[PDB]
């Protein structure tokens, strides 16, 4: 029974190199090529290249040319992948694969029936940045017959995660904290909002409490209606 075992996950800084292994068993290692596909959330699965164990022949994906190396060890039937000049964009889960059809005489590489369990690799700076917290003020007039939405914008922090509570956790009903988004700057931002009776807007006080462990940052911010 064909099995593909990979090496453990790792964390890396930008500029580093990485190497992961894939030990194959259950079949004649020489006869079929081995592929490396990487998966990253919100991105198309990316074929990085194949490697034929017999003579170590390789075909690297054009967009990775010069940064990637595929070797193998015949005796221990293990394939190896190496990636240089890592960036944030290299943060993904790395798989080794091999096609379904393989004989001593013939193969089709691409119907990937067999996958390794996957090696997750994270590339990020050790730098940490605290969040800016901006208030999302309710509105102008108090509508004594409806409800008001308010919140705070937790912007430009790195890395994940931030957390948001309201009134030190006493306020939870109608609260919505959205999953963070990754901006072009490389930094994260999320929104937290809470819907409340409008009549309470000039009576009850609303504080959003932002926690960002990596930067050792705890910020309290009062969201209040604009005066004009």
């Amino acid at each position: 029974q064909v099995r593909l075992s990979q090496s453990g996950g790792q964390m890396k800084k930008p500029g580093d190199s990485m190497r992961i292994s894939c030990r194959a068993s259950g079949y004649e290692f020489i006869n079929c090529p081995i592929n490396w596909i990487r998966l990253a959330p919100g991105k198309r699965p990316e074929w990085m290249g194949w490697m034929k164990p017999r003579h170590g022949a390789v075909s690297y994906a054009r967009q990775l040319q010069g940064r990637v190396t595929m070797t193998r060890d015949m005796y221990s039937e293990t394939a190896f992948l190496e990636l240089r000049s890592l960036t944030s964009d290299d943060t993904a889960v790395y798989f080794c694969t091999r096609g379904k059809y393989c004989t001593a005489r013939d193969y089709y590489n691409w119907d990937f029936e067999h996958w390794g369990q996957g090696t997750p690799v994270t590339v990020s700076s050790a730098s940490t940045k605290g969040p800016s917290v901006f208030p999302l003020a309710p509105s102008s007039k108090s509508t004594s017959g409806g409800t008001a939405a308010l919140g705070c914008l937790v912007k430009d922090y790195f890395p994940e995660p931030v957390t948001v509570s309201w009134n030190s956790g006493a306020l939870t009903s109608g609260v919505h904290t959205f999953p963070a988004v990754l901006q072009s700057s490389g930094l994260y931002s999320l929104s937290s909002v809470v819907t409340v009776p409008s009549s309470s807007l000039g009576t009850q006080t609303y504080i959003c409490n932002v926690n960002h462990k990596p930067s050792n940052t705890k910020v309290d911010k009062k969201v209040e209606p604009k005066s004009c």
Binding site: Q117, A137, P179, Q183, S191
Partner: protein
């Protein structure tokens, strides 16, 4: 080209999922399933052939350049993300997630102008909240002085609420303080099945 649609399917167990791939070049296409925290798995190869272990609830079809994976009677182990493959290339993926049926609810739309605290930074973020709606399918478009915006906005959606089975969406438009001060009318337009018409919430910069 290999274009996979749709991006997200929100379905209840029992319903059927219809995922499609449009391709520029004919040839053997495969479909892969990926359950959360697990390595992908070959489902269909050579267009319509079912891989070993795959029940006949999965089936492949092709009309012209359109290859389709349908999955009848969704079970728990059928949810996850699906990809199409042709040679070394893959589709963007289709996320098939569990949806709990409930009655249609139009969103409540709120819009938040930039903080005076933020404007001192040099950036301007306009936030548009779509609150407690169902189904998940919802379109947002930003308009500034009635001009459609592209590529200066990011969205975010919450998990289906465990109590009322609704979703909430937050979109954020980001402009420089300079670019921002150049325009007056900022608006987010929301189309949702719960609405008779696309609802637009807007404010005029400078006035309260």
């Amino acid at each position: 080209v290999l274009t996979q649609s749709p991006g997200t399917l929100s379905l209840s167990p029992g319903e059927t999922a219809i995922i499609s791939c449009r391709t520029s070049q004919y040839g053997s296409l495969a479909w892969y399933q990926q359950r959360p925290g697990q390595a992908p798995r070959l489902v269909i190869y050579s267009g319509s052939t079912r891989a070993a272990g795959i029940p006949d609830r999965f089936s492949g079809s092709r009309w012209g350049p359109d290859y389709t994976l349908t999955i009848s009677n969704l079970e728990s182990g059928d949810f996850g993300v699906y990809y199409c493959q042709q040679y070394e290339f893959f589709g963007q993926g289709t996320k098939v997630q569990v949806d709990i049926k409930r009655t249609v609810a139009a969103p409540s739309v709120f819009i938040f102008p930039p903080s005076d605290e933020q404007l001192k930074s040099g950036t301007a973020s306009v936030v548009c909240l779509l609150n407690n709606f169902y189904p998940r399918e919802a379109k947002v478009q930003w308009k500034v002085d009635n001009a459609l915006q592209s590529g200066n906005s990011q969205e975010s959606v919450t998990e289906q609420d465990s109590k009322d089975s609704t979703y909430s969406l937050s979109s954020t438009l980001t402009l420089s303080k300079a670019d921002y001060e150049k325009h007056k009318v900022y608006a987010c337009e929301v189309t949702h099945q719960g609405l008779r018409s696309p609802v637009t919430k807007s404010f005029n910069r400078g006035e309260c």
